[PDB]
Design a protein around this ligand. Structure first.
Ligand SMILES: OC[C@H]1O[C@@H](O[C@@H]2[C@@H](O)[C@H](O[C@@H]3[C@@H](O)[C@H](n4cc(CCC[n+]5cccc6ccccc65)nn4)O[C@H](CO)[C@H]3O)O[C@H](CO)[C@H]2O)[C@H](O)[C@@H](O)[C@@H]1O
Length: 430
């Protein structure tokens, strides 16, 4: 049974419970373990999730943000246990080792396959609230050209979900709070022909015993009035002053903010020595409640957002202009990564490379052949024909071009490295 968690849907700039029609406000907490797979999936481990859910119930949350799941594992036990306490999940599609790289952005078959795997693993659950297609990818004025890759990812995740048999779980974005870029980012993700379904801000402006006016919350709220998609704090909980009073929660669910924002999620459940936890897991794997816990609990308990209903509510935007060093996200987006096309390279290329060396060998190979066909430029909106293939496929293409330009036809690939091999399938006459 998922009785206690009806699916949430979006109408205009609000979330609604699909059965009752009541507006849905997120009262959440970030729930993610990390090592000190590379990531840890607490929702794949019943002994972990079933330990913590009673503590999450005490806090009074209705939503978790989860940053990374292992899509090869079952999540039925934990998702049903969450559902039984009225709890929903916001889930990032990426993981630290398979994310859009803000320093060298790409939207390719490897990242898209990750996104699809997560979608296929998690979309059966009615309490899956939504997916994030990225988290703080662009984070300042030096990497705004990453954002077209994120928008392509939003488009392609939505299309994959649309073409699947799954419920149409919304796909949004989570952004940081950099003064120079925030307004342009907010506009960019709702501009043109591809839009985020919702928009989370990682919002740390309220520290200690601040106020609506002095924190910045009043000006954030004014700039987001009339924003066309649901907006919430995908993270909050500045820890400058401890124990965190979480008095921002009273402002967030109050009358000035509840008509604009769809709530938010505290960062975070586990204490992991960034001093952001509300509990701490001891050496015996037991839960020790920290002094922040009771303040978050008290504030969420008091919070009573006056929303609207779906029926009464029911009665393109220009992309920011390009300016060098300020905003360099082209409106033109990279193409949908094509697994078949890129898989053809594995079949037909004479010289292949199995997955420091990428830098050296792209630099070597791209001095000898023209690598434009694998370059992707989010500033200029120029995306090479094979720029959507995996890093190894791209490198293999360039190696093979060099092999064909030499024209020896002797099965000797022109790069001495153990990962290089002649592909015998290339001989069988994409
Ligand atoms: O796509 C952009 C980048 O993505 C990186 O991986 C991401 C990871 O870095 C990211 O990690 C997640 C991390 O972002 C998040 N987190 C939240 C915080 C508190 C930040 C506080 N803070 C931030 C900024 C300004 C502040 C100002 C004042 C006060 C506080 C401020 N620190 N970390 O905590 C999660 C919990 O564990 C991580 O899982 O998770 C995403 C979801 O899986 C991954 O995509 C990739 O590794 C990187 O290559 C890529 O460039």
């Amino acid at each position: 049974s998922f009785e206690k968690t009806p699916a949430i849907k979006i109408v205009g700039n609000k979330f609604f419970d699909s059965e009752s029609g009541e507006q849905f406000f997120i009262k959440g907490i970030a729930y993610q373990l990390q090592r000190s797979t590379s990531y840890i999936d607490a929702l794949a481990d019943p002994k972990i999730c079933l330990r913590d859910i009673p503590f999450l119930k005490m806090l009074g949350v209705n939503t978790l943000r989860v940053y990374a799941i292992d899509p090869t594992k079952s999540h039925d036990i934990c998702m049903e246990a969450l559902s039984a306490e009225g709890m929903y999940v916001l889930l990032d599609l990426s993981e630290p080792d398979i994310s859009i790289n803000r320093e060298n952005p790409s939207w390719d078959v490897h990242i898209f396959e990750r996104y699809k795997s997560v979608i296929d693993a998690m979309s059966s659950f009615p309490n899956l609230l939504g997916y994030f297609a990225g988290n703080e990818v662009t984070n300042d004025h030096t990497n705004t050209f990453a954002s077209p890759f994120v928008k392509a990812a939003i488009r392609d995740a939505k299309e994959y979900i649309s073409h699947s048999n799954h419920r149409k779980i919304p796909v949004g974005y989570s952004t940081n709070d950099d003064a120079m870029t925030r307004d342009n980012l907010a506009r960019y993700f709702v501009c043109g022909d591809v839009k985020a379904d919702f928009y989370g801000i990682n919002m740390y402006e309220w520290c200690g015993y601040s106020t609506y006016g002095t924190s910045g919350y009043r000006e954030r709220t004014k700039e987001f009035e009339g924003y066309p998609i649901p907006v919430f704090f995908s993270e909050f909980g500045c820890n400058l002053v401890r124990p965190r009073p979480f008095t921002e929660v009273s402002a967030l669910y109050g009358n000035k903010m509840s008509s604009v924002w769809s709530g938010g999620l505290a960062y975070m459940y586990f204490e992991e020595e960034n001093e952001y936890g509300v509990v701490k897991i001891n050496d015996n794997d037991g839960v020790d409640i920290l002094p922040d816990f009771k303040n978050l609990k008290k504030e969420f308990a008091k919070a009573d957002p006056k929303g609207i209903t779906e029926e009464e509510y029911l009665t393109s935007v220009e992309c920011p202009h390009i300016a060098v060093g300020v905003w360099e996200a082209n409106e033109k987006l990279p193409e949908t990564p094509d697994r078949s096309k890129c898989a053809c390279l594995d079949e037909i290329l004479p010289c292949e490379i199995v997955p420091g060396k990428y830098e050296e060998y792209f630099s070597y190979l791209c001095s000898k052949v023209d690598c434009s066909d694998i370059l992707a430029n989010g500033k200029t909106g120029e995306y090479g024909e094979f720029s959507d293939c995996s890093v190894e496929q791209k490198l293999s293409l360039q190696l093979s071009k060099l092999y064909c330009k030499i024209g020896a036809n002797d099965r000797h690939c022109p790069l001495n490295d153990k990962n290089v091999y002649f592909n015998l399938e290339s001989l069988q006459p994409c």
